[PDB]
């Protein structure tokens, strides 16, 4: 297998619209009900839709009900929802999932970002290694919207990794850190980049760090 | 609508033992003709989407560890966890799928008592490369600690800094079941340039005395 995969999430004006798509394979769309759930980062679930089989019963969240919309289209194995007149407090990773017992199976999830707030793109800093162990990292600074995502050596380093939640900052825009451990022996032997990818403004960097 | 209320809000519980987490609702959630109570459970682990580890208020989803348990009926419900493991670490939540808004309980984190942790700590000057760009960020990091608790002090020249630094932790490890925390302490080039002693000083649990960490310019 089952996979949900939802797209079309992104940043938008506060008073505009968004319509979100789930694609789902691995089992018979057309025999289930199909819900959308959001939740702001760091907090809750929150209920937003459901549609049965046929799409021909619906229900809404109280917050949004007539605003969204909730659709499917069983030939194409695609739930939409398109949202309306966004507000604020409609910032979410927005989820699909399937209904059976539960809602059993559930997408990644896509970010919707509802802010007046311009694009920005990251700098990527080094954090240069504090040398038995060392520490050395990457400062990720000054984006917007979230999210950034930070590997280490095309992914061949994850032991020893803490990619550190994103804060917001007095500017208003994000910053966040990866670091990692390491044998304070291996800066004299080995590689080490940190590869960053801002999606939302195309910022894709892979920056040495060295002593 | 249905309102469900959890508890506690945050649990705090050691490796081995039973976990219990209660949801109650506003009203009953037991559908007569179907003779079930329509109540959901789920774990959401740090960074992923939720799981569904129980239906129906007591069928487990196949795959789902028999750890797991639901229990209850009517309007008092309940998700037992027998001999914690380091990876239970999570928020769980409870769902009534009975009448729309099919609507959550507020969740309940899930903390893993553990043995206490010293953090060691860490200390980066700023690059190049940003001062360049007429600003310096100083970062200190505690690694792999336990428990959650700790002060960051930020002394330039020994004097003691406020409101001008921000701490990230991230979430509890899911093999050590220890925490990380990051602090940056930010200032422009020229009041950087006017100082030389930038120290990081961290007590802790875990510590037997503060430990400081810094550099000169
Ligand atoms: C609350 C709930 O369990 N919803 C499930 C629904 O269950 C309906 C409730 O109206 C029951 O009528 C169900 O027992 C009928 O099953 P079936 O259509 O004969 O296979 O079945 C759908 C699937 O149709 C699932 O997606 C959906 O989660």
């Known amino acids: 297998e089952v996979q949900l995969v939802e797209s079309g999430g992104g940043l938008v004006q506060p008073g505009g619209s968004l319509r979100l798509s789930c694609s789902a394979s691995?089992?018979?769309?057309?025999?289930?009900?199909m819900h959308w759930v959001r939740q702001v980062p760091g907090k809750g679930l929150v209920w937003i839709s459901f549609?049965?089989?046929?799409?021909?019963?619906?229900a809404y969240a109280d917050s949004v009900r007539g605003r969204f919309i909730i659709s499917r289209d069983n030939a194409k194995n695609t739930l939409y929802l398109e949202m309306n007149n966004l507000r604020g407090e409609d910032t979410a990773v927005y989820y699909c999932a399937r209904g059976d017992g539960g809602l059993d199976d559930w997408g990644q999830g896509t970010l919707v970002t509802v802010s007046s707030a311009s694009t920005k793109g990251p700098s990527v800093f080094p954090l240069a290694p504090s040398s038995g162990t060392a520490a050395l990292g990457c400062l990720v600074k000054d984006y917007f919207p979230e999210p950034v995502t930070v590997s280490w050596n095309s992914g061949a380093l994850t032991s020893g990794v803490h990619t550190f939640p994103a804060v917001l900052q007095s500017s208003g825009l994000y910053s966040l850190s990866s670091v990692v451990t390491v044998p304070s022996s291996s800066l004299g032997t080995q590689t080490y980049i940190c590869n960053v990818n801002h999606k939302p403004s195309n910022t894709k960097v892979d920056k040495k760090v060295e002593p | 609508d249905i309102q469900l209320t959890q508890s506690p809000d945050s649990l705090a519980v050691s490796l081995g033992e039973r976990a219990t987490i209660n949801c109650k609702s506003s009203?009953?959630?037991?559908?007569?003709?179907?003779?079930?109570?329509?109540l959901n459970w789920y774990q959401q682990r740090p960074g992923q989407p939720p799981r569904l580890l129980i239906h129906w208020a007591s069928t487990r989803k196949s795959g789902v560890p028999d750890r797991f348990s639901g229990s209850g009926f009517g309007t008092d419900f309940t998700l037992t966890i027998t001999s914690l493991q380091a990876e239970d670490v999570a928020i769980y939540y409870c769902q009534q799928y009975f009448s729309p808004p099919y609507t959550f309980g507020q969740g309940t984190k899930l903390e893993i008592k553990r043995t206490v942790a010293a953090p060691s700590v860490f200390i980066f000057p700023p690059s190049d490369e940003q001062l360049k760009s007429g600003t310096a960020s100083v970062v200190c990091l505690l690694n792999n600690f336990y428990p959650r608790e700790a002060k960051v002090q930020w002394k330039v020249d020994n004097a003691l800094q406020s409101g001008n630094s921000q701490e990230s932790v991230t979430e509890q490890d899911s093999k050590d079941s220890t925490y990380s925390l990051s602090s940056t302490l930010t200032l422009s080039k020229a009041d950087y340039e006017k100082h030389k002693v930038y120290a990081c000083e961290v007590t802790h649990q875990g510590l037997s005395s503060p430990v400081t960490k810094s550099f000169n310019r």
């Open positions: 009203q009953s959630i037991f559908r007569t003709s179907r003779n079930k109570n329509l």
């Open positions: 549609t049965n089989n046929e799409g021909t019963t619906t």
């Open positions: 691995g089992f018979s769309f057309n025999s289930f009900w």
